[PDB]
Design an enzyme around this catalytic site. Structure first.
Site, PDB file in Angstrom:
ATOM      1  N   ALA A 123       0.851  -1.181   0.000  1.00 13.99           N
ATOM      2  CA  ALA A 123       0.000   0.000   0.000  1.00 13.99           C
ATOM      3  C   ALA A 123       0.890   1.234   0.000  1.00 13.99           C
ATOM      4  O   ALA A 123       1.896   1.284   0.703  1.00 13.99           O
ATOM      5  CB  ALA A 123      -0.923  -0.013   1.198  1.00 13.99           C
ATOM      6  N   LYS A 177      12.498 -12.774   5.871  1.00 17.94           N
ATOM      7  CA  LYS A 177      12.183 -11.394   5.470  1.00 17.94           C
ATOM      8  C   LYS A 177      13.341 -10.434   5.712  1.00 17.94           C
ATOM      9  O   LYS A 177      13.592  -9.529   4.910  1.00 17.94           O
ATOM     10  CB  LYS A 177      10.899 -10.857   6.135  1.00 17.94           C
ATOM     11  CG  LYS A 177       9.606 -11.504   5.612  1.00 17.94           C
ATOM     12  CD  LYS A 177       9.491 -11.418   4.090  1.00 17.94           C
ATOM     13  CE  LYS A 177       8.093 -11.809   3.587  1.00 17.94           C
ATOM     14  NZ  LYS A 177       7.889 -13.290   3.709  1.00 17.94           N
ATOM     15  N   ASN A 181      15.299  -8.124   2.802  1.00 23.94           N
ATOM     16  CA  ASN A 181      15.314  -6.699   3.053  1.00 23.94           C
ATOM     17  C   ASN A 181      16.714  -6.124   3.208  1.00 23.94           C
ATOM     18  O   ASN A 181      16.950  -5.021   2.729  1.00 23.94           O
ATOM     19  CB  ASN A 181      14.453  -6.399   4.273  1.00 23.94           C
ATOM     20  CG  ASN A 181      12.985  -6.475   3.943  1.00 23.94           C
ATOM     21  OD1 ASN A 181      12.302  -7.462   4.238  1.00 23.94           O
ATOM     22  ND2 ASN A 181      12.502  -5.462   3.264  1.00 23.94           N
TER      23      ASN A 181
HETATM   24  N1  LIG Z   1       3.069   0.169   3.006  1.00 27.42           N
HETATM   25  C1  LIG Z   1       3.362  -1.078   2.616  1.00 27.42           C
HETATM   26  O1  LIG Z   1       3.006  -1.548   1.350  1.00 27.42           O
HETATM   27  C2  LIG Z   1       4.155  -1.996   3.485  1.00 27.42           C
HETATM   28  C3  LIG Z   1       4.235  -3.345   3.135  1.00 27.42           C
HETATM   29  C4  LIG Z   1       4.872  -4.247   3.989  1.00 27.42           C
HETATM   30  C5  LIG Z   1       5.427  -3.787   5.190  1.00 27.42           C
HETATM   31  N2  LIG Z   1       5.333  -2.449   5.522  1.00 27.42           N
HETATM   32  C6  LIG Z   1       5.914  -2.021   6.807  1.00 27.42           C
HETATM   33  O2  LIG Z   1       4.919  -1.588   7.724  1.00 27.42           O
HETATM   34  C7  LIG Z   1       5.379  -0.513   8.532  1.00 27.42           C
HETATM   35  C8  LIG Z   1       4.416   0.657   8.308  1.00 27.42           C
HETATM   36  O3  LIG Z   1       4.591   1.038   6.971  1.00 27.42           O
HETATM   37  P1  LIG Z   1       3.690   2.114   6.210  1.00 27.42           P
HETATM   38  O4  LIG Z   1       4.195   2.008   4.815  1.00 27.42           O
HETATM   39  O5  LIG Z   1       2.268   1.888   6.568  1.00 27.42           O
HETATM   40  O6  LIG Z   1       4.203   3.490   6.871  1.00 27.42           O
HETATM   41  P2  LIG Z   1       3.471   4.909   6.959  1.00 27.42           P
HETATM   42  O7  LIG Z   1       2.588   5.163   5.810  1.00 27.42           O
HETATM   43  O8  LIG Z   1       4.502   5.951   7.173  1.00 27.42           O
HETATM   44  O9  LIG Z   1       2.541   4.802   8.285  1.00 27.42           O
HETATM   45  C9  LIG Z   1       3.005   4.980   9.612  1.00 27.42           C
HETATM   46  C10 LIG Z   1       2.034   5.989  10.236  1.00 27.42           C
HETATM   47  O10 LIG Z   1       2.280   6.148  11.617  1.00 27.42           O
HETATM   48  C11 LIG Z   1       2.249   7.519  11.987  1.00 27.42           C
HETATM   49  N3  LIG Z   1       3.033   7.642  13.220  1.00 27.42           N
HETATM   50  C12 LIG Z   1       4.378   7.856  13.363  1.00 27.42           C
HETATM   51  N4  LIG Z   1       4.676   7.798  14.680  1.00 27.42           N
HETATM   52  C13 LIG Z   1       3.534   7.570  15.369  1.00 27.42           C
HETATM   53  C14 LIG Z   1       3.254   7.453  16.721  1.00 27.42           C
HETATM   54  N5  LIG Z   1       4.229   7.558  17.615  1.00 27.42           N
HETATM   55  N6  LIG Z   1       1.964   7.209  17.128  1.00 27.42           N
HETATM   56  C15 LIG Z   1       0.942   7.085  16.209  1.00 27.42           C
HETATM   57  N7  LIG Z   1       1.215   7.211  14.874  1.00 27.42           N
HETATM   58  C16 LIG Z   1       2.491   7.461  14.465  1.00 27.42           C
HETATM   59  C17 LIG Z   1       2.856   8.151  10.785  1.00 27.42           C
HETATM   60  O11 LIG Z   1       2.583   9.528  10.768  1.00 27.42           O
HETATM   61  P3  LIG Z   1       3.839  10.472  10.398  1.00 27.42           P
HETATM   62  O12 LIG Z   1       4.507   9.995   9.121  1.00 27.42           O
HETATM   63  O13 LIG Z   1       3.210  11.822  10.235  1.00 27.42           O
HETATM   64  O14 LIG Z   1       4.874  10.380  11.517  1.00 27.42           O
HETATM   65  C18 LIG Z   1       2.195   7.378   9.643  1.00 27.42           C
HETATM   66  O15 LIG Z   1       0.921   7.904   9.281  1.00 27.42           O
HETATM   67  C19 LIG Z   1       6.847  -0.285   8.114  1.00 27.42           C
HETATM   68  O16 LIG Z   1       7.726  -1.082   8.912  1.00 27.42           O
HETATM   69  C20 LIG Z   1       6.873  -0.844   6.691  1.00 27.42           C
HETATM   70  O17 LIG Z   1       8.136  -1.318   6.302  1.00 27.42           O
HETATM   71  C21 LIG Z   1       4.707  -1.545   4.692  1.00 27.42           C
HETATM   72  C1  LIG Z   2      10.867  -7.029  -0.241  1.00 35.98           C
HETATM   73  C2  LIG Z   2      10.841  -5.524  -0.469  1.00 35.98           C
HETATM   74  C3  LIG Z   2      12.270  -5.007  -0.300  1.00 35.98           C
HETATM   75  C4  LIG Z   2      10.312  -5.353  -1.907  1.00 35.98           C
HETATM   76  O1  LIG Z   2      10.415  -3.998  -2.395  1.00 35.98           O
HETATM   77  C5  LIG Z   2       9.922  -4.836   0.552  1.00 35.98           C
HETATM   78  O2  LIG Z   2      10.052  -5.432   1.869  1.00 35.98           O
HETATM   79  C6  LIG Z   2      10.212  -3.371   0.694  1.00 35.98           C
HETATM   80  O3  LIG Z   2      10.100  -2.646  -0.311  1.00 35.98           O
HETATM   81  O4  LIG Z   2      10.534  -2.921   1.827  1.00 35.98           O
END
Ligand SMILES: NC(=O)c1ccc[n+]([C@@H]2O[C@H](COP(=O)([O-])OP(=O)(O)OC[C@H]3O[C@@H](n4cnc5c(N)ncnc54)[C@H](OP(=O)(O)O)[C@@H]3O)[C@@H](O)[C@H]2O)c1
Ligand SMILES: CC(C)(CO)[C@@H](O)C(=O)[O-]
Length: 293
Positions: A123, A177, A181
């Site tokens: 996402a 994972k 990464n």
């Molecule tokens: N997005 C994906 O497709 C995806 C897929 C697999 C894994 N992940 C993993 O999942 C995790 C989240 O990723 P994301 O992509 O969803 O990140 P993101 O869009 O940046 O979402 C994190 C949210 O948390 C907020 N936040 C920061 N500190 C906070 C706090 N202390 N209390 C409450 N809210 C807070 C952020 O706001 P601010 O930015 O304004 O601080 C942001 O809206 C990461 O480890 C990422 O690697 C993501």
């Molecule tokens: C596996 C991966 C590196 C694919 O882009 C994903 O975990 C990411 O983007 O963080």
């Protein structure tokens, strides 16, 4: 049926909030800065749009939640969770979904059941909407020795955002994972390239995988460098045209998750006396790129 607090209402959090809402669960977001409401804006894989305003930062809603779902960047996780844990019931499981490893080490005194998860859903934030880019699988299991069977959660979450698999031991999954990464994120961030460019760099990939396999070995999991390398290439082949999350962070001048990816690998290598020169250099390179902002 379920009452869930989602901590971290970004791309992942909004994906889960939407999914949980469609199944008639009661949910709120927990935001960094308290606000009137949590706005959820999601474009699904087909093109449909979900738009809702939900409760945010309600401490009573927290005190009566069946689950705390945490979808924060790894470096945001443990301070935010610690600050909610004395209000959440001692019995309510906390489910952490993030990239990288190292947060469990920061949450040893948590009394709640603690669970760890990985996901392959994708996402992306596009201005003011979240786009659901890809479907995937979420693997979940206990974070620690004392955390028990919450497989019932996997069943429930399978009806919300498939697929979800419970594992009685999630460690092997976290490491596999972590391995992919450790390769893709720093190299893409360094070369400013799509994932698929890394197919031209088999020696470097293999060098990183040998270091990772050595550490995973010492941490008590059977693997080989070849196995890790094969898995990296599957992921590369599957995501060839994608911009990795770390490269997206770099391009967008945001802080990266490096301290919980290669950074964590370095911490585990050093704890065992395993020399990891190549992971060290990638780590230093990413830290440097970040110092330019
Ligand atoms: N997005 C994906 O497709 C995806 C897929 C697999 C894994 N992940 C993993 O999942 C995790 C989240 O990723 P994301 O992509 O969803 O990140 P993101 O869009 O940046 O979402 C994190 C949210 O948390 C907020 N936040 C920061 N500190 C906070 C706090 N202390 N209390 C409450 N809210 C807070 C952020 O706001 P601010 O930015 O304004 O601080 C942001 O809206 C990461 O480890 C990422 O690697 C993501
Ligand atoms: C596996 C991966 C590196 C694919 O882009 C994903 O975990 C990411 O983007 O963080």
């Amino acid at each position: 049926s379920m009452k869930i607090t989602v901590l971290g209402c970004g791309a992942l959090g909004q994906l889960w909030l939407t999914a949980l809402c469609k199944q008639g669960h009661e949910v709120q977001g927990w935001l960094r800065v308290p606000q009137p409401y949590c706005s959820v804006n999601l474009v699904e894989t087909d093109g449909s749009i979900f738009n809702e305003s939900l409760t945010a930062n309600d401490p009573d809603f927290l005190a009566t939640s069946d689950l705390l779902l945490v979808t924060l960047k790894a470096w945001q996780v443990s301070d935010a969770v610690k600050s909610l844990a004395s209000t959440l019931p001692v019995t309510t499981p906390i489910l952490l979904i993030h990239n990288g490893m190292g947060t469990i080490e920061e949450l040893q005194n948590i009394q709640q059941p603690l669970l760890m998860g990985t996901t392959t859903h994708a996402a992306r934030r596009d201005g003011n909407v979240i786009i659901h880019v890809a479907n995937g699988i979420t693997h979940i299991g206990p974070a620690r020795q004392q955390d028990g069977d919450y497989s019932y959660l996997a069943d429930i979450l399978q009806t919300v955002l498939p697929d979800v698999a419970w594992h009685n031991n999630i460690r092997a999954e976290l490491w596999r994972k972590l391995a992919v990464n450790c390769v893709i994120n720093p190299l893409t961030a360094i070369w400013n390239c799509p994932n698929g460019e890394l197919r031209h760099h088999p020696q470097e990939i293999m060098q990183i995988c040998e270091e990772v396999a050595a550490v995973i070995e010492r941490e008590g999991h059977h693997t080989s460098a070849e196995d890790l390398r094969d898995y990296v290439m599957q992921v590369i082949d599957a995501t060839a045209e994608n911009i990795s999350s770390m490269l997206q962070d770099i391009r967008a001048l945001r802080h990266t998750e490096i301290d919980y990816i290669n950074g964590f690998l370095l911490r585990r290598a050093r704890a065992h006396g395993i020399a990891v020169p190549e992971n060290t250099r990638l780590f230093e390179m990413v830290k440097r790129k970040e110092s330019e902002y």
